Design an enzyme around this catalytic site. Structure first.
Site, PDB file in Angstrom:
ATOM      1  N   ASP A   3      20.521  53.954  36.246  1.00  0.00           N
ATOM      2  CA  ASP A   3      21.051  54.225  37.588  1.00  0.00           C
ATOM      3  C   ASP A   3      20.420  55.440  38.242  1.00  0.00           C
ATOM      4  O   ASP A   3      20.144  55.439  39.447  1.00  0.00           O
ATOM      5  CB  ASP A   3      22.564  54.422  37.575  1.00  0.00           C
TER       6      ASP A   3
ATOM      7  N   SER B 266      40.650  54.055  43.601  1.00  0.00           N
ATOM      8  CA  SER B 266      39.738  54.981  42.934  1.00  0.00           C
ATOM      9  C   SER B 266      39.677  56.317  43.662  1.00  0.00           C
ATOM     10  O   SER B 266      38.623  56.941  43.777  1.00  0.00           O
ATOM     11  CB  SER B 266      38.337  54.370  42.866  1.00  0.00           C
TER      12      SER B 266
ATOM     13  N   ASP C 112      37.050  52.951  35.301  1.00  0.00           N
ATOM     14  CA  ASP C 112      36.015  52.798  34.283  1.00  0.00           C
ATOM     15  C   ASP C 112      36.529  53.128  32.885  1.00  0.00           C
ATOM     16  O   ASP C 112      36.468  52.297  31.974  1.00  0.00           O
ATOM     17  CB  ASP C 112      34.802  53.675  34.608  1.00  0.00           C
TER      18      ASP C 112
ATOM     19  N   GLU D 289      30.038  45.994  37.666  1.00  0.00           N
ATOM     20  CA  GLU D 289      28.841  45.519  36.953  1.00  0.00           C
ATOM     21  C   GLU D 289      28.905  44.036  36.587  1.00  0.00           C
ATOM     22  O   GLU D 289      27.877  43.370  36.503  1.00  0.00           O
ATOM     23  CB  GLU D 289      28.564  46.381  35.719  1.00  0.00           C
TER      24      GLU D 289
ATOM     25  N   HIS E  14      26.877  47.881  30.783  1.00  0.00           N
ATOM     26  CA  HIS E  14      26.872  48.950  29.786  1.00  0.00           C
ATOM     27  C   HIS E  14      28.234  49.174  29.163  1.00  0.00           C
ATOM     28  O   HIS E  14      28.335  49.368  27.957  1.00  0.00           O
ATOM     29  CB  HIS E  14      26.390  50.258  30.424  1.00  0.00           C
TER      30      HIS E  14
ATOM     31  N   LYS F  64      22.177  51.775  31.318  1.00  0.00           N
ATOM     32  CA  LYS F  64      22.540  51.928  32.725  1.00  0.00           C
ATOM     33  C   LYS F  64      23.069  53.348  32.964  1.00  0.00           C
ATOM     34  O   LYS F  64      22.732  53.988  33.965  1.00  0.00           O
ATOM     35  CB  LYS F  64      23.604  50.897  33.124  1.00  0.00           C
TER      36      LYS F  64
END
Ligand SMILES: O=C(O)C1=C[C@@H](OP(=O)(O)O)[C@@H](O)[C@H](O)C1
Length: 427
Positions: free
Chosen positions: A49, A197, A313, A341, A385, A411
Site C-alpha cells: 500500500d 469508523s 480492522d 479488501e 492480508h 499489503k
C-alpha cells in the site's frame, strides 16, 4: 498456488517492534508531498500500500529518497496541489486510503489523471466521495462501473457547501478533510447521517494538524474548513507503529501466552485500533500500557458480544480469537467489512467454518460458536492480508493450519510470519 503451513505453537512470548502504521504512512506521504518544505518520515511502513502511494508521488513528479530498509523517507514538498495531465494513469493496487485521498486531492486546480487499481479496487465504492467532490466543483468521470474506480479526474474542486455520506466509509470524509484546506474557497462539509469508523477521522485531523492545518469540527456532523491554506513540513516526523498489525500479536498472547509486548504504540497513540487491547481485556486477558508499548498477558478467554464499528480492522482478529474463547462471540455493526479488501463477513464466516466453528453470517454482524476442538484446514485468503494474519492464529492450537497465498500479507505487513515466528515458542 503458494501456501505456508504453520505448525502448532505451544506458547507465545516476547517482544515485537511494530512495522509503521499504514494509515499514518500514506496520509503523511500525501501531506508531505503537498506541503512546503522537506519532511523526513521515520518508521515509515514498507508494504504494498505504501509502495503504491510512493509510486504515485513519483509519477506526479514529487522527489523523495528512501533509506535502505525503506522506513526513512525524505520528501521534497511540492508546496501546493500536485499536478499531471494527459490522463496519466496512477495504479493504486488495492490501497483504499491512497485511492480515496488522491481522488479528492487531485481534484484541486486543473488536472487530467486517471486513478485505477487491482480488480478488487474496482469493486470498492467511491461514489459518496465523488458526489461530495462534484458538489464542490470537481469534474469526475467513472470509466467503468458508476460509483467505483477507475476515475478520470479533471479538476475544479473550489470548495463551498459539500455534503458527504459517512455511512459506508469514513475514508471519503478523510479525503475531503485533507483536500479542502487547499481549495480557494472555504468549505463546509456536512455529514448526511451516520459516520462509521469514526476513529480514523481523528487520525486524519491529527496528521493535518502536524502539517499545520486545523479545521472546525462540529460534533463530527459538520466540518468548517477555511480555504487558501498551505501544508507545512513538520521536519522529522515519527510514524507510529501499526496498531492493527499489533492486534495479531496481542491476541496471540491472550490465547497462548505468556506475555507479548508490542513496541511503537502506547497509551498516547492516535490510532483507534489500540482499543483492540480493551476488547482482549474484556475477554479476560491482562493488558499493560506503556508510553511506547502495549503488552498482553494470558489470563482467560471468554466470548463477548459487542459493537465493533470503532475498530473494524482489528475486530477481524477477535473473530479468529473467538475460536479459543468460552462461549459464543458476536461482533456487531461491521457492515463495511463487506466493501474492504474482500467481503470480510463472507470470507471470515467461510474460513471459520472450515476449522470447525458454527458461524452465523449476519448482514452486518457475525456470530461464532467455537468447536470443542479445531480441525486442520487450508485457508483461502481472498487477496486479503488480514485473512492470512487472522487465520495464522489457528496454529495456537493442537492443529497445524495451511495459509494460501501467504504473501498477501505484504499489503501492510511483509514480515508478518517471521514476526509471529519470533514470539512462537516450543515451551
Ligand atoms: O482511514 C484509514 O486509514 C482506514 C480506515 C478504515 O476504512 P472505513 O472507513 O471504510 O471503515 C480501515 O478499514 C482501513 O484499513 C484504513
Amino acid at each position: 498456488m503458494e501456501s505456508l503451513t504453520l505448525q502448532p505453537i505451544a506458547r507465545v512470548d516476547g517482544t515485537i517492534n511494530l512495522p509503521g502504521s499504514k494509515s499514518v504512512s500514506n496520509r503523511a506521504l500525501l501531506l508531505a508531498a503537498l506541503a512546503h518544505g522537506k519532511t523526513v518520515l521515520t518508521n515509515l511502513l514498507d508494504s504494498d500500500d505504501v509502495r503504491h502511494m510512493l509510486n504515485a508521488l513519483t509519477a506526479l513528479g514529487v522527489s523523495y529518497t528512501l533509506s535502505a530498509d525503506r522506513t526513512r523517507c525524505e520528501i521534497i514538498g511540492n508546496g501546493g496541489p500536485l499536478h499531471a495531465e494527459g490522463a496519466l494513469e496512477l495504479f493504486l493496487g488495492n490501497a483504499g486510503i491512497a485511492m480515496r485521498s488522491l481522488a479528492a486531492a487531485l481534484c484541486l486546480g486543473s488536472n487530467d489523471i486517471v486513478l485505477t487499481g487491482e480488480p478488487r479496487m474496482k469493486e470498492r465504492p467511491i461514489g459518496h466521495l465523488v458526489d461530495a467532490l462534484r458538489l464542490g466543483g470537481a469534474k469526475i468521470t467513472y470509466l467503468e462501473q458508476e460509483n467505483y474506480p477507475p476515475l478520470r479526474l479533471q479538476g475544479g474542486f473550489t470548495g463551498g457547501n459539500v455534503d458527504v455520506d459517512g455511512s459506508v466509509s469514513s475514508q471519503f470524509l478523510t479525503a475531503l478533510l485533507m483536500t479542502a484546506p487547499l481549495a480557494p474557497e472555504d468549505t463546509v462539509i456536512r455529514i448526511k447521517g451516520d459516520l462509521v469508523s469514526k476513529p480514523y477521522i481523528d487520525i486524519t485531523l491529527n496528521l493535518m494538524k502536524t502539517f499545520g492545518v486545523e479545521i472546525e469540527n462540529q460534533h463530527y456532523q459538520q466540518f468548517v474548513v477555511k480555504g487558501g491554506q498551505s501544508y507545512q513540513s513538520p521536519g522529522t516526523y515519527l510514524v507510529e507503529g501499526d496498531a492493527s498489525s499489533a492486534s495479531y500479536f496481542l491476541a496471540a498472547a491472550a490465547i497462548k501466552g505468556g506475555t507479548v509486548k508490542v513496541t511503537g504504540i502506547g497509551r498516547n497513540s492516535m490510532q483507534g485500533d489500540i482499543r483492540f487491547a480493551d476488547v482482549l481485556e474484556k475477554m479476560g486477558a491482562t493488558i499493560c500500557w506503556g508510553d511506547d508499548y502495549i503488552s498482553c498477558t494470558r489470563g482467560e478467554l471468554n466470548a463477548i458480544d459487542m459493537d465493533m464499528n470503532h475498530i473494524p480492522d482489528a475486530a477481524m482478529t477477535i473473530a479468529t480469537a473467538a475460536l479459543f474463547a468460552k462461549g459464543t462471540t458476536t461482533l456487531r455493526n461491521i457492515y463495511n467489512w463487506r466493501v474492504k479488501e474482500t467481503d470480510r463477513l463472507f470470507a471470515m464466516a467461510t474460513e471459520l467454518r472450515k476449522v470447525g466453528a458454527e458461524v452465523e453470517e449476519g448482514h452486518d454482524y457475525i456470530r461464532i460458536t467455537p468447536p470443542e476442538k479445531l480441525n486442520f484446514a487450508e485457508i483461502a485468503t481472498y487477496n486479503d492480508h488480514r485473512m492470512a494474519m487472522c487465520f495464522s492464529l489457528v496454529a495456537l492450537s493442537d492443529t497445524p493450519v495451511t495459509i494460501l497465498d501467504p504473501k498477501c500479507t505484504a499489503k501492510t505487513f511483509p514480515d508478518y510470519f517471521e514476526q509471529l515466528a519470533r514470539i512462537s515458542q516450543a515451551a
